[PDB]
Amino acid sequence: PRYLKGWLEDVVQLSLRRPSVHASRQRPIISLNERILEFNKRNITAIIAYYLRKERDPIEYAKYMEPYAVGLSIKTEEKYFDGSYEMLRKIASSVSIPILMNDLIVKESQIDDAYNLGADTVLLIVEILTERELESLLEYARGYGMEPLILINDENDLDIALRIGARFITIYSMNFETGEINKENQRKLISMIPSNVVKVPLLDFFEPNEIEELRKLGVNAFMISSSLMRNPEKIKELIEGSLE
């Protein structure tokens, strides 16, 4: 990885030391980005349900979101989010929709864990990896049949991601030291992405109007965290018309 400081470097060193799992995956890969493509052709609003334990139960949240979300994001970082590989494994073997393993992935054995635990794709972060490392892990994920979700926070991230051939990009526009999502630069970054790349902004809190606005910006799917954890029912109004 790159040399970083503070809590990022703490997590990165923990991820480097993360022991591999010895599970064997018990179902095929349900590709997240292809399912977003299918949702797009059918004009179905594609919502990725962003789950992090630290507060609802992981299985309950996953079963609830299964009929409505285009896929789940499961944070498996253990220290600052209290995720776990076993939690992801229980989730993947009980829901039928794609599972994104959300973690700080810095080594190939983490992608091996993801594949072996039932996850369908992985998150790769331009800011923590060298450009060649990111290219290597992107190609490595593809060899498993996983098109990974490439996280960009700024313009330089995006140009690295486009240069190395990312086709699945999530726009956080987030400062990891604070956790604040700058929605304006997020909108600008979304505009800078070619149309042929599946682009997915992260929205912690949202109002129903800004989803239609981002939809006008050409967004393929929405990863929503905090709002859907506080009110899971909010996803229904996003993906279907009301009968009442």
Side-chain angles (χ1 to χ4, degrees), residues 85 87-89 91-139:
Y85 278 155
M87 179 189 63
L88 160 71
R89 188 193 195 179
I91 284 187
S93 84
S94 37
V95 309
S96 51
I97 61 180
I99 310 292
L100 160 80
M101 192 181 86
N102 200 314
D103 208 327
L104 274 89
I105 288 152
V106 295
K107 56 175 182 164
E108 292 181 337
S109 99
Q110 283 172 287
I111 300 180
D112 293 316
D113 306 332
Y115 178 86
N116 291 322
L117 293 151
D120 298 282
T121 196
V122 290
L123 186 77
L124 299 175
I125 304 175
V126 183
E127 275 192 358
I128 67 183
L129 309 165
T130 71
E131 171 186 64
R132 160 195 156 89
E133 273 181 316
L134 172 72
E135 182 157 12
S136 157
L137 290 172
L138 160 63
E139 285 172 0

Side-chain angles (χ1 to χ4, degrees), residues 31-33 35-53 57-59 61-85 87-89 91-176 178-183 185-186 189-193:
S31 149
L32 174 53
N33 76 301
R35 208 199 177 208
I36 287 160
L37 290 182
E38 290 281 33
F39 271 48
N40 288 167
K41 283 194 252 192
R42 318 222 203 290
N43 265 267
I44 309 179
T45 299
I47 303 302
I48 303 169
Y50 191 103
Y51 177 80
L52 56 153
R53 226 210 293 257
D57 183 79
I59 290 172
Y61 186 90
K63 294 304 294 184
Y64 185 88
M65 286 303 184
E66 191 184 20
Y68 312 115
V70 83
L72 304 195
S73 176
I74 306 304
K75 202 84 173 169
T76 54
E77 201 281 319
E78 307 182 297
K79 185 170 239 242
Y80 299 80
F81 304 91
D82 205 27
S84 85
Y85 278 155
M87 179 189 63
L88 160 71
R89 188 193 195 179
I91 284 187
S93 84
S94 37
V95 309
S96 51
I97 61 180
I99 310 292
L100 160 80
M101 192 181 86
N102 200 314
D103 208 327
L104 274 89
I105 288 152
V106 295
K107 56 175 182 164
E108 292 181 337
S109 99
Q110 283 172 287
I111 300 180
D112 293 316
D113 306 332
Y115 178 86
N116 291 322
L117 293 151
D120 298 282
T121 196
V122 290
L123 186 77
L124 299 175
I125 304 175
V126 183
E127 275 192 358
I128 67 183
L129 309 165
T130 71
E131 171 186 64
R132 160 195 156 89
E133 273 181 316
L134 172 72
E135 182 157 12
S136 157
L137 290 172
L138 160 63
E139 285 172 0
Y140 190 68
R142 282 173 179 162
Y144 268 123
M146 306 177 153
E147 181 63 18
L149 191 47
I150 309 299
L151 190 159
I152 69 180
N153 284 311
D154 50 39
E155 303 210 352
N156 191 234
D157 287 1
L158 176 58
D159 224 20
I160 292 177
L162 295 171
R163 168 160 60 258
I164 62 136
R167 277 120 57 170
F168 196 21
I169 294 189
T170 183
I171 303 96
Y172 274 41
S173 265
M174 166 189 295
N175 185 277
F176 282 133
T178 65
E180 276 324 289
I181 298 122
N182 179 22
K183 308 232 176 180
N185 183 37
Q186 172 177 77
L189 283 173
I190 289 162
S191 299
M192 295 182 254
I193 305 176

Side-chain angles (χ1 to χ4, degrees), residues 211-214 217-229:
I211 291 317
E212 255 277 27
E213 304 289 291
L214 295 174
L217 253 53
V219 152
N220 303 75
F222 307 83
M223 200 143 66
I224 293 166
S225 28
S226 303
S227 298
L228 294 198
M229 212 150 319

Side-chain angles (χ1 to χ4, degrees), residues 4 6-9 11-17:
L4 321 159
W7 92 275
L8 269 194
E9 194 67 13
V11 156
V12 162
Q13 292 301 308
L14 213 55
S15 314
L16 282 170
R17 272 136 55 194

